[PDB]
Write an enzyme that holds these catalytic residues in place. Structure first.
Site, PDB file in Angstrom:
ATOM      1  N   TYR A 197      27.599  25.807   4.372  1.00 46.50           N
ATOM      2  CA  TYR A 197      29.042  26.310   4.426  1.00 46.50           C
ATOM      3  C   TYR A 197      29.559  27.694   4.322  1.00 46.50           C
ATOM      4  O   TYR A 197      30.381  27.921   5.303  1.00 46.50           O
ATOM      5  CB  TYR A 197      29.533  25.421   2.903  1.00 46.50           C
ATOM      6  CG  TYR A 197      30.800  25.211   2.776  1.00 46.50           C
ATOM      7  CD1 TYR A 197      31.687  24.500   2.929  1.00 46.50           C
ATOM      8  CD2 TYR A 197      31.613  26.441   1.844  1.00 46.50           C
ATOM      9  CE1 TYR A 197      32.826  24.069   2.708  1.00 46.50           C
ATOM     10  CE2 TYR A 197      33.047  26.240   1.654  1.00 46.50           C
ATOM     11  CZ  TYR A 197      33.723  24.962   2.083  1.00 46.50           C
ATOM     12  OH  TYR A 197      35.027  24.801   1.730  1.00 46.50           O
ATOM     13  N   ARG A 245      39.752  11.599   9.808  1.00 46.18           N
ATOM     14  CA  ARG A 245      38.974  10.685  10.441  1.00 46.18           C
ATOM     15  C   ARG A 245      38.839   8.983  10.055  1.00 46.18           C
ATOM     16  O   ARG A 245      38.559   8.263  11.188  1.00 46.18           O
ATOM     17  CB  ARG A 245      37.273  10.774  10.291  1.00 46.18           C
ATOM     18  CG  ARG A 245      36.340  10.756  11.141  1.00 46.18           C
ATOM     19  CD  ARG A 245      34.972  11.201  10.729  1.00 46.18           C
ATOM     20  NE  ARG A 245      34.344  10.255   9.817  1.00 46.18           N
ATOM     21  CZ  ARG A 245      34.110   9.927   8.540  1.00 46.18           C
ATOM     22  NH1 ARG A 245      34.756  11.127   7.847  1.00 46.18           N
ATOM     23  NH2 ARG A 245      33.456   9.098   7.982  1.00 46.18           N
ATOM     24  N   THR A 265      45.571  14.512   5.124  1.00 44.41           N
ATOM     25  CA  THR A 265      46.053  13.271   4.372  1.00 44.41           C
ATOM     26  C   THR A 265      45.655  13.505   2.710  1.00 44.41           C
ATOM     27  O   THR A 265      46.099  12.375   2.220  1.00 44.41           O
ATOM     28  CB  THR A 265      45.251  12.125   4.832  1.00 44.41           C
ATOM     29  OG1 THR A 265      43.771  12.385   4.715  1.00 44.41           O
ATOM     30  CG2 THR A 265      45.535  11.709   6.512  1.00 44.41           C
ATOM     31  N   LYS A 317      31.877  29.363   7.026  1.00 47.20           N
ATOM     32  CA  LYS A 317      33.028  30.011   6.458  1.00 47.20           C
ATOM     33  C   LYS A 317      33.053  31.596   6.909  1.00 47.20           C
ATOM     34  O   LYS A 317      34.154  31.948   7.224  1.00 47.20           O
ATOM     35  CB  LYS A 317      33.134  29.734   5.094  1.00 47.20           C
ATOM     36  CG  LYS A 317      33.716  28.610   4.652  1.00 47.20           C
ATOM     37  CD  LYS A 317      34.701  27.747   5.422  1.00 47.20           C
ATOM     38  CE  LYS A 317      35.034  26.325   5.211  1.00 47.20           C
ATOM     39  NZ  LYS A 317      36.312  25.618   5.731  1.00 47.20           N
ATOM     40  N   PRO A 333      42.122  15.007  -6.732  1.00 51.02           N
ATOM     41  CA  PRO A 333      41.418  13.862  -7.022  1.00 51.02           C
ATOM     42  C   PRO A 333      39.809  13.816  -6.630  1.00 51.02           C
ATOM     43  O   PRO A 333      39.003  13.506  -7.909  1.00 51.02           O
ATOM     44  CB  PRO A 333      41.854  12.629  -6.186  1.00 51.02           C
ATOM     45  CG  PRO A 333      43.306  13.125  -6.075  1.00 51.02           C
ATOM     46  CD  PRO A 333      43.166  14.733  -5.843  1.00 51.02           C
ATOM     47  N   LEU A 334      39.270  14.494  -5.770  1.00 51.02           N
ATOM     48  CA  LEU A 334      37.952  14.699  -5.465  1.00 51.02           C
ATOM     49  C   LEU A 334      37.094  15.330  -6.414  1.00 51.02           C
ATOM     50  O   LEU A 334      35.943  14.907  -6.882  1.00 51.02           O
ATOM     51  CB  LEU A 334      37.799  15.070  -4.207  1.00 51.02           C
ATOM     52  CG  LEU A 334      37.737  14.036  -2.805  1.00 51.02           C
ATOM     53  CD1 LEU A 334      37.529  14.483  -1.536  1.00 51.02           C
ATOM     54  CD2 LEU A 334      36.955  12.751  -3.201  1.00 51.02           C
ATOM     55  N   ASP A 337      38.628  13.089  14.240  1.00 51.29           N
ATOM     56  CA  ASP A 337      37.681  13.815  13.639  1.00 51.29           C
ATOM     57  C   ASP A 337      37.500  15.158  14.322  1.00 51.29           C
ATOM     58  O   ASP A 337      37.374  15.261  15.378  1.00 51.29           O
ATOM     59  CB  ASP A 337      36.435  13.188  13.876  1.00 51.29           C
ATOM     60  CG  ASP A 337      34.859  13.568  13.243  1.00 51.29           C
ATOM     61  OD1 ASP A 337      34.198  13.071  12.806  1.00 51.29           O
ATOM     62  OD2 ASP A 337      34.995  14.938  13.187  1.00 51.29           O
TER      63      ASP A 337
HETATM   64  N1  LIG Z   1      38.945  21.226  -3.234  1.00 51.73           N
HETATM   65  C1  LIG Z   1      38.783  22.372  -3.512  1.00 51.73           C
HETATM   66  O1  LIG Z   1      38.448  22.725  -4.599  1.00 51.73           O
HETATM   67  C2  LIG Z   1      38.496  23.449  -2.346  1.00 51.73           C
HETATM   68  C3  LIG Z   1      38.130  24.661  -2.758  1.00 51.73           C
HETATM   69  C4  LIG Z   1      37.734  25.602  -1.685  1.00 51.73           C
HETATM   70  C5  LIG Z   1      37.978  25.369  -0.481  1.00 51.73           C
HETATM   71  N2  LIG Z   1      38.389  24.047   0.254  1.00 51.73           N
HETATM   72  C6  LIG Z   1      38.449  23.831   1.413  1.00 51.73           C
HETATM   73  O2  LIG Z   1      40.091  23.908   1.757  1.00 51.73           O
HETATM   74  C7  LIG Z   1      39.973  22.895   2.909  1.00 51.73           C
HETATM   75  C8  LIG Z   1      41.109  21.740   2.501  1.00 51.73           C
HETATM   76  O3  LIG Z   1      40.623  20.766   1.377  1.00 51.73           O
HETATM   77  P1  LIG Z   1      41.295  19.268   1.078  1.00 51.73           P
HETATM   78  O4  LIG Z   1      41.850  19.533  -0.327  1.00 51.73           O
HETATM   79  O5  LIG Z   1      42.374  18.872   2.265  1.00 51.73           O
HETATM   80  O6  LIG Z   1      40.012  18.495   0.942  1.00 51.73           O
HETATM   81  P2  LIG Z   1      39.640  17.284   0.053  1.00 51.73           P
HETATM   82  O7  LIG Z   1      38.437  17.675  -0.670  1.00 51.73           O
HETATM   83  O8  LIG Z   1      40.567  16.651  -1.038  1.00 51.73           O
HETATM   84  O9  LIG Z   1      39.362  16.458   1.096  1.00 51.73           O
HETATM   85  C9  LIG Z   1      38.776  16.626   2.180  1.00 51.73           C
HETATM   86  C10 LIG Z   1      39.714  16.951   3.514  1.00 51.73           C
HETATM   87  O10 LIG Z   1      38.972  17.086   4.782  1.00 51.73           O
HETATM   88  C11 LIG Z   1      39.569  16.365   5.908  1.00 51.73           C
HETATM   89  N3  LIG Z   1      38.407  15.944   6.793  1.00 51.73           N
HETATM   90  C12 LIG Z   1      36.870  16.179   6.418  1.00 51.73           C
HETATM   91  N4  LIG Z   1      36.211  15.788   7.415  1.00 51.73           N
HETATM   92  C13 LIG Z   1      36.980  15.673   8.534  1.00 51.73           C
HETATM   93  C14 LIG Z   1      36.890  15.684   9.854  1.00 51.73           C
HETATM   94  N5  LIG Z   1      35.741  15.501  10.481  1.00 51.73           N
HETATM   95  N6  LIG Z   1      38.199  15.587  10.718  1.00 51.73           N
HETATM   96  C15 LIG Z   1      39.505  15.587  10.023  1.00 51.73           C
HETATM   97  N7  LIG Z   1      39.597  15.789   8.789  1.00 51.73           N
HETATM   98  C16 LIG Z   1      38.529  15.760   8.001  1.00 51.73           C
HETATM   99  C17 LIG Z   1      40.058  15.250   4.874  1.00 51.73           C
HETATM  100  O11 LIG Z   1      41.410  14.630   5.527  1.00 51.73           O
HETATM  101  C18 LIG Z   1      40.747  15.686   3.760  1.00 51.73           C
HETATM  102  O12 LIG Z   1      41.895  16.239   3.775  1.00 51.73           O
HETATM  103  C19 LIG Z   1      38.584  22.530   3.503  1.00 51.73           C
HETATM  104  O13 LIG Z   1      38.345  23.412   4.706  1.00 51.73           O
HETATM  105  C20 LIG Z   1      37.781  22.746   2.359  1.00 51.73           C
HETATM  106  O14 LIG Z   1      36.561  23.224   3.230  1.00 51.73           O
HETATM  107  C21 LIG Z   1      38.483  23.139  -1.006  1.00 51.73           C
HETATM  108  C1  LIG Z   2      34.419  25.442  -2.538  1.00 51.24           C
HETATM  109  C2  LIG Z   2      33.131  24.401  -2.113  1.00 51.24           C
HETATM  110  O1  LIG Z   2      32.766  24.425  -1.099  1.00 51.24           O
HETATM  111  C3  LIG Z   2      32.632  23.173  -2.614  1.00 51.24           C
HETATM  112  C4  LIG Z   2      31.705  22.408  -2.192  1.00 51.24           C
HETATM  113  C5  LIG Z   2      31.135  21.331  -2.577  1.00 51.24           C
HETATM  114  C6  LIG Z   2      31.478  21.006  -3.930  1.00 51.24           C
HETATM  115  C7  LIG Z   2      32.357  21.701  -4.548  1.00 51.24           C
HETATM  116  C8  LIG Z   2      32.974  22.738  -4.216  1.00 51.24           C
END
Ligand SMILES: NC(=O)c1ccc[n+]([C@@H]2O[C@H](COP(=O)([O-])OP(=O)(O)OC[C@H]3O[C@@H](n4cnc5c(N)ncnc54)[C@H](O)[C@@H]3O)[C@@H](O)[C@H]2O)c1
Ligand SMILES: CC(=O)c1ccccc1
Ligand SMILES: NC(=O)c1ccc[n+]([C@@H]2O[C@H](COP(=O)([O-])OP(=O)(O)OC[C@H]3O[C@@H](n4cnc5c(N)ncnc54)[C@H](O)[C@@H]3O)[C@@H](O)[C@H]2O)c1
Ligand SMILES: NC(=O)c1ccc[n+]([C@@H]2O[C@H](COP(=O)([O-])OP(=O)(O)OC[C@H]3O[C@@H](n4cnc5c(N)ncnc54)[C@H](O)[C@@H]3O)[C@@H](O)[C@H]2O)c1
Ligand SMILES: NC(=O)c1ccc[n+]([C@@H]2O[C@H](COP(=O)([O-])OP(=O)(O)OC[C@H]3O[C@@H](n4cnc5c(N)ncnc54)[C@H](O)[C@@H]3O)[C@@H](O)[C@H]2O)c1
Ligand SMILES: CC(=O)c1ccccc1
Ligand SMILES: CC(=O)c1ccccc1
Ligand SMILES: CC(=O)c1ccccc1
Ligand SMILES: [Mg+2]
Ligand SMILES: [Mg+2]
Lengths: 251, 251, 251, 251
Positions: free
Chosen positions: D155, D38, D15, D159, D193-194, D62
């Site tokens: 984390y 969730r 989402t 991973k 956005p986050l 979740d």
């Molecule tokens: N944003 C980054 O810079 C970044 C960098 C490295 C890795 N990641 C990883 O990549 C993946 C995707 O990130 P994203 O941008 O969709 O995340 P996001 O940070 O923008 O938002 C978190 C995401 O995880 C979901 N989420 C969290 N807990 C959950 C649960 N219990 N059940 C179902 N959904 C849940 C939300 O729907 C959301 O899409 C994740 O596994 C994260 O660990 C993100």
């Molecule tokens: C890549 C990653 O895990 C992360 C976790 C927390 C904050 C920012 C980035």
């Protein structure tokens, strides 16, 4: 003490820094040692600094010199009996990106760092196999065999090559029951006189973004992992990479 | 001799096989040792088989038991002084594919192999940091932390986790100048009484398609790499994986 | 459709097997393509089999030939405008252990598989940087860049070299804002006419101990990952290895 | 266009950010999609933003909720027919060192990032095997599955676990001829956005010592590699890690 009893080792580029520490600790553990270097002025002094001729000798040799490798093995065997242990440690660096590497620089580095390790590994297998020596070939293969560096293009090629070629050799030796193991050692940055002579180098390498310990290592750090790999302690280790880098590749 | 002088080690699952060899060689090198196991009948005999109470003791503990980890450290310190060395060796296996792993099997394996290593690593850092001990945490992390096996699904999860979590801990320790190193050891197949009791197992693991050396290793193969990592010889090694597998992951 | 619009690619060894599929799919996605091969009889037919001269041409070239690489880039640019994409695909194998590799075999393989990739990468960076092309260099680097094979000693050296040299080049390009990415592709065993002509080869490679899928792949398997890497879809991928091997390196 | 024709995908945490881009591109390529989160307030809006109910729906879940995974598959199949594709994307982070991770934080992260991927992978295999769907499970497994970070201890565990557990599952699927592939995707830092809401975060991640490209990626960078892996284009890729990180792990 005694961890290398009866072993007979060749260490290329054994007259300075990491190579000299490997030779020093090898002798201390009971190994007989032949050290090499392209330059005689360095090698003669170096051997004597470590021990007596019955313990350690020098043989002038450029590891890029194929025919000299035979002479080297023959001299070692003459001095100390059949060779059990080879540390391919001699290496050079060119401080160029891939983009900026001349073909002459490319060929020169590959001759020492890649051809030389190939010549030594190939001959070592041929000379050490099937003799019950607990033979071990240790190829120096760098943090730069795992990660790239923008200004070490040819070096990175050479170190990645050594890393995987060593696996090939380990496997063939294992499958054929040769009693020869082949492994690689991967130093991070290590403090030597040469690093000391490069202003700013140790400080740059000690930044936490480079080495997480916040300092670089010392020659003995590499010597000790080599002792383990030369010794029968490591008789089930082959085809593996042993990294001693202060955390450099962990981040 | 003397390679672990003054060290005080905890070895989880130290009463059998790899763990017992690690304890044996540790004692032989001058370390004081506390070995653990969930079962008292095994641990009591095991300690005595290695040495005297001034050298080595047993403490009953399931590594999955968080609160017991504190008791364990306290008992060790009472016996031998501050702990310098932790080998997280206790582990179990479930012989199931991911597809066929029950949630109960999953939770049970992760409790020992992952939570237990986490509890021990976390506490070890807290208890060993900033004491000038040359502290070392050695996490047992398997060939199965590098490659998958179709019938070791939960095991593979646990071993991949330990492999990378150990890097995290190494980095934080290095960056904070804690004087604690964290590294992983990756055994291939090792001959023990338990493997001997599994008909056909050693032969299957010794096929060249599995272990290129054509045979499996012995407990001491793992003990010796642990000595190196517990000793100050390895003071610049942190965040690294040390593989002793007879070539298994090289092909 | 359209995934490579406006791109201009050179593919070395583009006249057969994997290289030909890469060329075919490239053309299908909108790229203009120059394919090479040491032999003109093959290349002329191959281009026509894929498309018209406005889509795809042949240029006779041995990738080991430094000066010819310039001629190749010039010819491509003449035909199609500035080059955006280079796939260093030409390679040869020697079926020898390290022990049994002649120096002539060694030099011959390294000339094509290593020098040739170096010459192409270096020139590609120089010709493609700072032009807003979304430039991509894709270096073919094999499962044999990850694991050893007892009978592919020189090949393993070449593929490990390419694997890590590519990282060096990626990093320098990224750091300098060159708008050039460099990545490696790692095929497992792929069915071609040449494999078909080697009796028993496909069956040997399809044994579960070699390829867990129980069969080998097809040229298009490699073409599709190349499309992704040549396209702007992959604009944040650099310095990475992309493996398409039927599970070969996962066990 | 058309690269995912006939496919039916579940994307957990679909989402927002990376998950939402994966859903968007999936729909654009012809896949039917169920996204989860969730929180219902987010998911309902998100689906509609991408397409119509015949293309894409939301299911509140979740990923740590075992029994809900069954409900999720059932709902997807009800909406769109048998599931061919699972992207285990939901994840959370705790910003703690191993030393400073509470047991509650530890359990909470492992429930989502590890148990949740296990539950989804296990069920996916059971539901997708032997149906001729060209089934693909794509597990999100991070740069933090390759390297450690001092402040991402739990984390990193999660991973690394996903990285190697995925190999186990790939192998069993391949060996059993299930017509299910399992691979991991490893994003570097991606702008969402986050990340935008965390002051200083994007700038810190864009320093050349972190991301050599000097900037972070965008959600579509991850979407495109997922399309490739969900599509039959990747039918010989299983058990492999696909890294899209701007060079982060190459140095
Ligand atoms: N944003 C980054 O810079 C970044 C960098 C490295 C890795 N990641 C990883 O990549 C993946 C995707 O990130 P994203 O941008 O969709 O995340 P996001 O940070 O923008 O938002 C978190 C995401 O995880 C979901 N989420 C969290 N807990 C959950 C649960 N219990 N059940 C179902 N959904 C849940 C939300 O729907 C959301 O899409 C994740 O596994 C994260 O660990 C993100
Ligand atoms: C890549 C990653 O895990 C992360 C976790 C927390 C904050 C920012 C980035
Ligand atoms: N010094 C460091 O910080 C460092 C860091 C990472 C890796 N390394 C690597 O570790 C290995 C050992 O380094 P060292 O400290 O002994 O080096 P050094 O920098 O102190 O001196 C260079 C060494 O290589 C030898 N040498 C160079 N060309 C040679 C040739 N053609 N034939 C024979 N010998 C030759 C010399 O005898 C000398 O011992 C090398 O392979 C090098 O590539 C060094
Ligand atoms: N034996 C082999 O061939 C082999 C091969 C690869 C890896 N390993 C791994 O190496 C490590 C050491 O094996 P080992 O030979 O000492 O094992 P073993 O198979 O001979 O016996 C199991 C060991 O684990 C301990 N143990 C199990 N659950 C425990 C718990 N909850 N708390 C404390 N201790 C517990 C026992 O004391 C015992 O020493 C393990 O992590 C295992 O996962 C073993
Ligand atoms: N066929 C397989 O099963 C397989 C498996 C793993 C890897 N590979 C590797 O993948 C790449 C592509 O293979 P392919 O199927 O196009 O090969 P192929 O075996 O069908 O034919 C060899 C290819 O290399 C070219 N070639 C050889 N020497 C050359 C030179 N000096 N200059 C220019 N071209 C030259 C030919 O044009 C031809 O396309 C190679 O680098 C090879 O090392 C192939
Ligand atoms: C590690 C390394 O290769 C190096 C090379 C040149 C100068 C300083 C270090
Ligand atoms: C190495 C390993 O995990 C194992 C597990 C179960 C049985 C035999 C070996
Ligand atoms: C993959 C590979 O290198 C090869 C080489 C020679 C023959 C068959 C395969
Ligand atoms: Mg790094
Ligand atoms: Mg393997």
């Amino acid at each position: 003490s005694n961890r290398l009893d009866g072993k007979v080792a060749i260490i290329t580029g054994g007259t300075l820094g990491i190579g000299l520490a490997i030779a020093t600790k090898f002798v201390e553990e009971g190994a007989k040692v032949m050290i090499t270097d392209r330059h005689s002025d360095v090698g003669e002094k170096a051997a004597k600094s470590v021990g007596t001729p019955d313990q350690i000798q020098f043989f002038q040799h450029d590891s890029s010199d194929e025919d000299g490798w035979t002479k080297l093995f023959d001299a070692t065997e003459k001095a100390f009996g059949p060779v059990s242990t080879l540390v391919n440690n001699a290496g050079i660096a060119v401080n160029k990106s891939v983009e900026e590497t001349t073909t002459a620089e490319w060929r020169k580095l590959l001759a020492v760092n890649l051809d030389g390790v190939f010549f030594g590994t190939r001959l070592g297998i041929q000379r050490m196999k099937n003799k019950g020596l607990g033979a071990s070939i240790i190829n120096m293969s760098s943090i730069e065999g795992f990660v790239g560096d923008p200004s070490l293009g040819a070096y990175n090629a050479s170190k990645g090559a050594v890393r995987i070629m060593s696996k090939s050799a380990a496997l063939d030796c294992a499958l054929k029951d040769y009693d020869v193991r082949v492994n690689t050692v991967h130093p991070g940055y290590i403090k030597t006189p040469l690093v000391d002579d490069l202003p700013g180098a140790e400080e740059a390498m000690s930044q936490r973004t480079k080495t997480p310990m916040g300092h670089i290592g010392e020659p003995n750090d590499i010597a000790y992992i080599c002792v383990y790999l030369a010794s029968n302690e490591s008789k089930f280790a082959t085809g593996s990479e042993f990294v001693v880098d202060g955390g450099y590749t962990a981040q």
